[PDB]
Amino acid sequence: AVGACVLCNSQTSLRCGACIRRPFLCCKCCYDHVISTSHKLVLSVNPYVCNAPGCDVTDVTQLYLGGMSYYCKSHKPPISFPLCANGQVFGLYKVTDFNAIATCDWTNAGDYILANTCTERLKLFAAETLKATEETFKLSYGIATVREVLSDRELHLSWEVGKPRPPLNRNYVFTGYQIGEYTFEKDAVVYRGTTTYKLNVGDYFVLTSHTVMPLSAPTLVPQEHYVRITGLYPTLNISDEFSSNVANYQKVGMQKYSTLQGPPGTGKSHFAIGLALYYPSARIVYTACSHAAVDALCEKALKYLPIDKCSRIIPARARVECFDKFKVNSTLEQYVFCTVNALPETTADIVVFDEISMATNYDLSVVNARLRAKHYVYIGDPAQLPAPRTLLTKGTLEPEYFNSVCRLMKTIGPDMFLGTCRRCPAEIVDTVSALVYDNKLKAHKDKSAQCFKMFYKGVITHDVSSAINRPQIGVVREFLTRNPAWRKAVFISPYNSQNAVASKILGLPTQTVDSSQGSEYDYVIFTQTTETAHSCNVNRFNVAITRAKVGILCIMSDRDLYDKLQFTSLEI
Ligand SMILES: [Zn+2]
Ligand SMILES: [Zn+2]
Numbered sequence: 001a002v003g004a005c006v007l008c009n010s011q012t013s014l015r016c017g018a019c020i021r022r023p024f025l026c027c028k029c030c031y032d033h034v035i036s037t038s039h040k041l042v043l044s045v046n047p048y049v050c051n052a053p054g055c056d057v058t059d060v061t062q063l064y065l066g067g068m069s070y071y072c073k074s075h076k077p078p079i080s081f082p083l084c085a086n087g088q089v090f091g092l093y094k095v096t097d098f099n100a101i102a103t104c105d106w107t108n109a110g111d112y113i114l115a116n117t118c119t120e121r122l123k124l125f126a127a128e129t130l131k132a133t134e135e136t137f138k139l140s141y142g143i144a145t146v147r148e149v150l151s152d153r154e155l156h157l158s159w160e161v162g163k164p165r166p167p168l169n170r171n172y173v174f175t176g177y178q179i180g181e182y183t184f185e186k187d188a189v190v191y192r193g194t195t196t197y198k199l200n201v202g203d204y205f206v207l208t209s210h211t212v213m214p215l216s217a218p219t220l221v222p223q224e225h226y227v228r229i230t231g232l233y234p235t236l237n238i239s240d241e242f243s244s245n246v247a248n249y250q251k252v253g254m255q256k257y258s259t260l261q262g263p264p265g266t267g268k269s270h271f272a273i274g275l276a277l278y279y280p281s282a283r284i285v286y287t288a289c290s291h292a293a294v295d296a297l298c299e300k301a302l303k304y305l306p307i308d309k310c311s312r313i314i315p316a317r318a319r320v321e322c323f324d325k326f327k328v329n330s331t332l333e334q335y336v337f338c339t340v341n342a343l344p345e346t347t348a349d350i351v352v353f354d355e356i357s358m359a360t361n362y363d364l365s366v367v368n369a370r371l372r373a374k375h376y377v378y379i380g381d382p383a384q385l386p387a388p389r390t391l392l393t394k395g396t397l398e399p400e401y402f403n404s405v406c407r408l409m410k411t412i413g414p415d416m417f418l419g420t421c422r423r424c425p426a427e428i429v430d431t432v433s434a435l436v437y438d439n440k441l442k443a444h445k446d447k448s449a450q451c452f453k454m455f456y457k458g459v460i461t462h463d464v465s466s467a468i469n470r471p472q473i474g475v476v477r478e479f480l481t482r483n484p485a486w487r488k489a490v491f492i493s494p495y496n497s498q499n500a501v502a503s504k505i506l507g508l509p510t511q512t513v514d515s516s517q518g519s520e521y522d523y524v525i526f527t528q529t530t531e532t533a534h535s536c537n538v539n540r541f542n543v544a545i546t547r548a549k550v551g552i553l554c555i556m557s558d559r560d561l562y563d564k565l566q567f568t569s570l571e572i
C-alpha cells in the first residue's frame with residue numbers, strides 16, 4: 001500500500017487499478033499514464049472513486065477532492081480540487097514506453113521488442129505483466145474429458161463445446177483431475193502421464209496455470225570490472241584439456257558477469273564444468289530453464305567433478321524423469337545443478353546459467369533474486385531457439401529481443417566466443433557459419449561427404465495447424481531402402497505431426513527441431529515439411545542441421561535455405 005513508482009521510484013500511495021499488475025505510480029507518472037491510456041482507475045489506501053451513494057464514477061479525470069473524500073463533477077462540493085490537473089494526480093509525497101507495456105495484448109513482436117529496449121524497471125514490469133497475461137489466457141480454453149481408454153499409450157477424448165481446443169503437443173502440459181500432469185500426441189491420440197495411473201474415464205484435465213510472483217531483482221545485475229580475480233582462487237595444475245579456456249575462466253573472475261556465445265558443439269558444457277576445475281574451491285550453482293539442459297550439465301560434471309560434492313535439485317512436484325546419479329536435494333553440496341523454477345534461496349561463488357537463448361527476462365530476474373553470487377556466467381547462443389512465446393502470433397521475434405543477455409550478445413557482442421565446432425561435418429559448419437555466425441565459426445571435422453540435400457515440395461496436409469508432408473516422408477523411405485546405414489538416424493522436422501507420421505512409416509526415432517536443441521546424433525534426417533516462417537526460421541534451421549556428427553539428409557521446401565545448404569544434392 002505504501003510503495004515505490006515503477007518508473008521514477010518516487011514513493012506514493014498511488015497505484016494503477018487498470019494495470020493487470022497494479023503498479024505503484026507517482027503523481028507525475030500516474031497523470032501521464034491515465035491521460036494517455038484507457039487506464040483511469042487510480043488506487044491508494046482508498047480507491048479514487050465517487051464517494052457519493054450509488055455513483056459509478058471511477059475515472060480519475062472526472063474526479064475531485066471534497067475535503068478528505070473524492071467525488072465526481074456532479075457530486076463534488078463547492079470547495080473541491082480536480083484529482084487530475086497540473087501534470088500530477090493528487091497523492092502523498094507530491095513514460096510512452098510504460099503505457100505501451102501496460103496496455104498491450106502481447107500478440108505482436110513489437111511488444112516483446114519494447115519489453116527489452118526499455119529501462120531495467122520497465123523490463124521487470126513488462127516480464128511480470130506478460131507472464132500474468134499468459135497465465136490468465138490459459139483460463140480461456142476447453143476441458144478434455146476421457147471418453148474411452150484403448151490401451152496403455154492410447155485414448156479418446158470429449159472436448160468442451162464453445163471453448164477453443166489447445167494444440168496437442170508436449171509444449172502444453174495439462175494437469176489431470178488430482179492425478180498428476182499429463183501430455184498429448186496424435187481418432188487415436190496418445191496419453192503421457194508423468195505419474196502412472198490407470199486412465200480413468202470421466203476424469204477430466206485442465207491447463208497448468210501457476211501464480212505470477214512479483215519481480216524484485218534486475219534481469220542483469222550492474223556490471224563490475226575488477227583488476228584481479230575477485231573471491232575466486234585459481235589452480236596452476238589446470239589440465240591441458242581446459243588450457244584453451246584458462247584465459248576466459250580468468251575473464252570470469254575479473255567481471256561481475258560475463259557472456260559466452262557457443263555455437264553448436266563448440267564446448268559449452270566442457271567450458272562450464274572446466275570453470276569448476278579452474279576455481280576448485282568455488283561453490284558453483286549450475287542452472288538452466290529446462291531439466292534436459294541441467295541434465296546435460298550433470299552428465300558433463302559426472303566425468304570431471306567429484307560425485308560427492310554434486311547435488312541435482314529436484315522439485316517436490318517431480319514432473320518428468322531427470323538425472324539420477326547425484327545426491328538429490330542437498331542444497332549445500334559444492335556443485336548444485338538445478339532448473340530456474342526450483343532454485344532455492346542460496347548464495348554461490350559462481351552461478352552458471354546455460355541455454356541462455358531459452359531464458360525469458362522473468363527467468364533472468366528470478367535467478368538474480370534466488371541466488372546472490374560473486375560471479376555470474378551466461379552461456380548460450382542467440383543463433384539458437386528462444387523460449388516459446390505462446391501469446392505472440394504477429395511478427396517474428398529477433399535474437400536481440402529474446403532476453404537482456406541475448407540483447408547484449410547481439411548488440412555489443414559476447415564477452416567470450418567459442419569459435420571452433422568439434423561436432424559437425426564441415427558441410428554443416430560452413431553452412432551455419434555463413435547463415436548465423438558471420439563466418440566466425442570454424443570447422444574442426446573435415447567434410448564427412450555424408451551431408452545431402454533434396455529439393456522436394458511434396459504435399460502439405462494439416463492436423464489442426466501442425467503440418468504433415470507424406471511425400472517428403474516417402475522420399476526418406478526410398479532413401480533408407482538405398483542407404484540402410486541411415487537406419488541408425490534420428491528423424492527431425494519442425495512439426496510434431498510430421499514426426500508422428502514418420503515414426504509410424506519409417507520407424508526412426510523422432511525429435512522436433514525445438515526438442516533436439518542441445519542433443520547430438522551421428523545421423524539426422526530432416527524434412528522441412530513446409531515453407532512457413534516457422535520452418536524457414538534461421539535459428540530453427542541452424543539447430544536442425546547442427547544436430548549431426550556424421551551425416552545429414554535435408555529434404556527441403558524453401559529454395560533459399562536449400563541453395564544455402566553446402567551439401568551434395570540428390571536426385572528423384
Ligand atoms: Zn514516477
Ligand atoms: Zn495502467
Ligand SMILES: [Zn+2]
Binds near residue numbers: 050052057074075
Ligand atoms: Zn458522483
